[PDB]
Design an enzyme around this catalytic site. Structure first.
Site, PDB file in Angstrom:
ATOM      1  N   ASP A  27      54.714  91.892  23.972  1.00 26.81           N
ATOM      2  CA  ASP A  27      54.211  91.685  25.327  1.00 26.81           C
ATOM      3  C   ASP A  27      54.378  90.221  25.737  1.00 26.81           C
ATOM      4  OD1 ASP A  27      52.936  91.724  27.768  1.00 26.81           O
ATOM      5  OD2 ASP A  27      51.099  92.677  27.043  1.00 26.81           O
ATOM      6  N   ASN A  32      52.540  92.333  34.093  1.00 26.76           N
ATOM      7  CA  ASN A  32      53.164  93.606  34.428  1.00 26.76           C
ATOM      8  C   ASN A  32      52.615  94.779  33.613  1.00 26.76           C
ATOM      9  OD1 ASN A  32      54.533  93.528  31.866  1.00 26.76           O
ATOM     10  ND2 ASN A  32      56.163  92.293  32.782  1.00 26.76           N
ATOM     11  N   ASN A 139      69.590 113.882  31.958  1.00 26.38           N
ATOM     12  CA  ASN A 139      69.368 115.315  31.800  1.00 26.38           C
ATOM     13  C   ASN A 139      68.237 115.816  32.690  1.00 26.38           C
ATOM     14  OD1 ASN A 139      69.506 118.009  30.237  1.00 26.38           O
ATOM     15  ND2 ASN A 139      67.388 117.349  29.894  1.00 26.38           N
ATOM     16  N   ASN A 193      65.011 124.110  31.171  1.00 29.38           N
ATOM     17  CA  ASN A 193      64.163 122.931  30.996  1.00 29.38           C
ATOM     18  C   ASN A 193      63.804 122.661  29.540  1.00 29.38           C
ATOM     19  OD1 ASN A 193      64.209 122.859  33.786  1.00 29.38           O
ATOM     20  ND2 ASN A 193      62.083 123.534  34.050  1.00 29.38           N
ATOM     21  N   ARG A 227      73.416 104.406  25.589  1.00 32.27           N
ATOM     22  CA  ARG A 227      72.986 105.466  24.693  1.00 32.27           C
ATOM     23  C   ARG A 227      72.527 106.653  25.528  1.00 32.27           C
ATOM     24  NH1 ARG A 227      68.186 108.682  23.464  1.00 32.27           N
ATOM     25  NH2 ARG A 227      68.169 109.088  21.205  1.00 32.27           N
ATOM     26  N   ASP A 229      70.866 110.058  26.285  1.00 31.05           N
ATOM     27  CA  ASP A 229      69.822 110.923  25.745  1.00 31.05           C
ATOM     28  C   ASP A 229      70.153 112.409  25.915  1.00 31.05           C
ATOM     29  OD1 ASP A 229      66.941 111.550  24.857  1.00 31.05           O
ATOM     30  OD2 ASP A 229      66.952 112.377  26.890  1.00 31.05           O
ATOM     31  N   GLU A 258      73.059 111.210  21.771  1.00 26.21           N
ATOM     32  CA  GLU A 258      72.120 111.734  20.792  1.00 26.21           C
ATOM     33  C   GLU A 258      72.294 113.243  20.632  1.00 26.21           C
ATOM     34  OE1 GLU A 258      68.681 112.931  22.312  1.00 26.21           O
ATOM     35  OE2 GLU A 258      67.390 112.843  20.535  1.00 26.21           O
ATOM     36  N   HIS A 328      63.183 106.647  16.644  1.00 23.80           N
ATOM     37  CA  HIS A 328      61.854 106.802  17.198  1.00 23.80           C
ATOM     38  C   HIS A 328      61.351 108.197  16.848  1.00 23.80           C
ATOM     39  CE1 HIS A 328      65.192 107.687  19.721  1.00 23.80           C
ATOM     40  NE2 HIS A 328      64.492 108.313  20.650  1.00 23.80           N
ATOM     41  N   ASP A 329      62.278 109.121  16.622  1.00 25.59           N
ATOM     42  CA  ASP A 329      61.935 110.538  16.528  1.00 25.59           C
ATOM     43  C   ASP A 329      61.767 111.002  15.078  1.00 25.59           C
ATOM     44  OD1 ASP A 329      61.964 110.976  19.342  1.00 25.59           O
ATOM     45  OD2 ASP A 329      64.141 111.226  19.307  1.00 25.59           O
TER      46      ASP A 329
END
Ligand SMILES: [Ca+2]
Ligand SMILES: [Ca+2]
Length: 685
Positions: A27, A32, A139, A193, A227, A229, A258, A328-329
């Site tokens: 940070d 912000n 997407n 979806n 990148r 997604d 990805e 991250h996943d």
């Protein structure tokens, strides 16, 4: 100017990417920070904003933390404006901290900063010779419900503040309304979806135009890579046309997508995407196998090299694979209550291996956490003295300085269940990498062969990971040594190339008129000739020429797969870059639809045509199998295909399997493609 330059936006194998989840990294501006429910001051809810921004990244570039590591590229969260509403799932508050819930692809997420902040990030990074890659997620827009407009933001899409439309009352057909996907097939996951995320309809012309415009905005601000997604959940054809539009514009850049793969999984569609979309891929086979070998110990070193070989055989552009050991996943590579040597060895292997290494933030600080929220904790510390930090610092610059690392072949020189000794080789340059995952036992190594010249080599890591020096005799014979327990060592020799050698050509796909970049060694300082197959490109078609990089214009040559070679001013020829896909021209996305095409079980409808994009009437190069479930139902078949714009297409549909090839009746179909827009054509069998 040279291949290693920060200005080379197109090729990345000399680089080391550092993936930052922006909100979780630093940070640098509390101003912000989102207020209220959207913010977690005490960081107890990992689904809310923590306050990480672009200013923090800037600070970490300036004070030297990121630069000291030797990382040369930053992959950051999607920068675009996201919904600012708090959505409760199963009782817990959720925000758009991750940046995947887009509202406006032409504005900034104010939590990360404004456009001046972003331009300052680009500028600071470029000043420190660091490239900038952004996440881009076309997407979808955000969580939405058709029959409940009050939920979330209703997946609203604005064009620079101007409401284009929301999920409820979508009169324009901006989104798909085919329900949610069950991930049962590729088709089902493309036109439906993902959970509640409002699926964009890229067959809508306004959407194609909108996203081309948006990405041109961001590239216009100096972004060096994208990148993409969820490339698995968008049509192949649309994406091909899209990156084609990028490559044909002012800012050709490195693109990679990805496409998730589970452990011990290979996927033909994944392979086909990597080889023929014009976009590259995150290397999940590599990642999963390395996790199995070092982290979970469910595979051995032998298995690992087998995956290296199989991926080498599978992928046509193996230097473009973006490798990684977590993301991250995934669960953090560091398991709580485990040695840090595992991480260090995985890092060394990745940093010295083929492709484009990507390192998830915090990896060098051994951050732990399993599951989507927990693996995204705040950056724990900026300790420059950790062993992993020093490993990255030691090995990352080798991708710039040593051509073997960045462009070289991969060769198994020694293999145990516990020991992997691999050699990278490019011309007269080479790197030998030795790893012993066994934490109790050292292994004597004898009879090792290499391509290293005679003499003594020190460990580039300088024994940081208990590595050792080696002596090499004639014929590349390495004198006996003992690889210590948990040992890891890198030995290398860099030589000047005196003959033209191509390491990489980017992009891998292009229409005539596009500027491609050719990296390597020994090209000479004076403009020579660049060859597409046998077709020559002479001095005018040479945008630029120097020893390690040539920028050239694609000549008007027959479309299809083509070898790219180089010839010096002297007239000395180079090696050939295999399988460069020349396009017929500028691309648009056409939806082909064919009705009353009945097939027995096991037979599928395919598309063939008079253009290379349609296989040039070759039923082996046919487009398919086509879809018959969601956009249109069997016996209607449909497919979204990248085709040359403003082109009179002649085409037929076929039925394959067996392959009893059945062709359509009588005369061909004829359709003139739109010059710019996407299109749809509908015929009967
Ligand atoms: Ca902030
Ligand atoms: Ca989709």
């Amino acid at each position: 100017s040279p291949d290693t330059s920060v200005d080379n936006k197109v090729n990345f194998s000399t680089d080391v990417i550092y993936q930052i989840v922006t909100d979780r990294f630093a940070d640098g501006d509390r101003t912000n920070n989102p207020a209220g429910d959207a913010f977690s001051g005490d960081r107890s809810n990992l689904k809310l904003y923590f306050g990480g921004d672009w200013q923090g990244i800037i600070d970490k570039i300036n004070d030297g933390y990121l630069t000291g590591m030797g990382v040369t590229a930053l992959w950051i969260s999607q920068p675009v404006e996201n919904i600012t509403s708090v959505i409760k799932y199963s009782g817990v508050n959720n925000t758009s901290y991750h940046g995947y819930w887009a509202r406006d692809f032409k504005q900034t997420n104010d939590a990360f900063g404004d456009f001046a902040d972003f331009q300052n990030l680009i500028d600071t990074a470029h000043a420190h010779n660091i490239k900038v890659v952004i996440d881009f997620a076309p997407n979808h827009t955000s969580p939405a419900d058709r029959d409940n407009p009050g939920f979330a933001e209703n997946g609203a899409l604005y064009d620079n503040g101007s409401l284009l439309g929301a999920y409820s009352n979508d009169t324009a057909g901006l989104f798909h309304h085919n329900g949610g996907t069950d991930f049962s097939t590729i088709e089902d996951g493309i036109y439906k979806n993902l959970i509640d995320l409002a699926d964009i309809n890229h067959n809508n012309n306004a959407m194609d135009a909108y996203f081309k415009s948006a990405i041109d905005l961001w590239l216009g601000m100096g972004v060096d890579g994208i990148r993409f997604d969820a490339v698995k959940h968008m049509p192949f054809g649309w994406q091909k046309s899209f990156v084609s539009s990028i490559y044909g514009g002012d800012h050709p850049v490195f693109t990679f997508g990805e496409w998730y793969l589970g452990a011990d999984q290979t996927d033909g569609d994944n392979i086909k995407f990597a080889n023929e979309s014009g976009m590259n891929l995150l290397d999940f086979e590599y990642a999963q196998e390395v996790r199995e070998v070092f982290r979970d110990k469910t595979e051995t070193m032998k298995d690992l090299y087998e995956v290296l070989a199989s991926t080498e055989s599978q992928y046509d552009y193996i230097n473009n694979m973006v490798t990684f050991i977590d993301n991250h996943d995934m669960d953090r590579f560091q398991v709580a209550g485990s040695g840090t040597r595992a991480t260090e060895q995985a890092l060394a292997l990745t940093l010295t291996s083929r492709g484009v290494p990507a390192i998830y933030y915090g990896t060098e600080q051994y951050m732990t956490g399993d599951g989507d929220p927990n693996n995204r904790a705040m950056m724990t510390s900026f300790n420059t003295g950790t062993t992993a930090y020093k490993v990255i610092q030691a090995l990352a610059p080798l991708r710039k300085s040593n051509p073997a690392i960045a462009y070289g072949t991969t060769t198994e020189r020694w293999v145990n269940n516990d020991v992997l000794i691999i050699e990278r080789k490019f011309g007269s340059s080479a790197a030998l990498v030795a790893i012993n995952r066994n934490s109790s036992a050292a292994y004597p190594i004898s009879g090792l062969l290499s391509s290293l010249p005679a003499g003594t080599y020190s460990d580039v890591l300088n024994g940081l990971l208990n590595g050792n020096s080696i002596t090499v005799g004639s014929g590349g014979a390495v004198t006996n040594f003992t690889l210590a327990a948990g040992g890891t060592a890198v030995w290398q020799y860099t030589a000047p190339e005196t003959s033209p050698a191509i390491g990489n050509v980017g992009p891998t796909m292009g229409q005539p008129g596009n500027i491609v970049t050719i990296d390597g060694r020994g090209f000479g300082g004076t403009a020579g000739t660049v060859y597409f197959g046998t077709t020559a490109v002479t001095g005018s078609g040479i945008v630029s020429w120097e020893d390690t990089q040539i920028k050239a214009v694609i000549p008007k040559v027959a479309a299809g797969k083509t070898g790219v070679s180089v010839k010096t001013s002297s007239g000395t020829a180079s090696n050939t870059f295999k399988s460069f896909n020349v396009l017929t021209g500028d691309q648009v996305t056409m939806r082909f639809l064919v009705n009353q095409a009945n097939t027995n079980y096991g037979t599928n409808v395919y598309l063939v045509g008079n253009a290379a994009e349609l296989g040039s009437w070759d039923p082996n190069k046919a487009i398919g199998p086509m879809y018959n479930q969601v956009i249109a139902k069997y016996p209607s078949w449909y497919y979204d295909v990248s085709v040359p714009a403003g082109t009179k297409l002649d085409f037929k549909f076929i039925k394959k399997g067996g392959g009893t090839v059945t062709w359509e009746g009588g005369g061909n179909h004829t359709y003139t493609t739109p010059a710019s827009s996407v299109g749809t054509v509908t015929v009967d069998w």
